[PDB]
Amino acid sequence: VPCSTCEGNLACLSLCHIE
Numbered sequence: 001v002p003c004s005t006c007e008g009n010l011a012c013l014s015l016c017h018i019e
Helices: 008-014
Strands: none
Touching: none
16 A cells, blocks of 8 residues: 555555655
8 A cells, every 4th residue: 555665556656654
């Protein structure tokens, strides 16, 4: 889920925590 781990997948990045 976290935005540093989605890395350009806009679905993963939409669910995420911003860190």
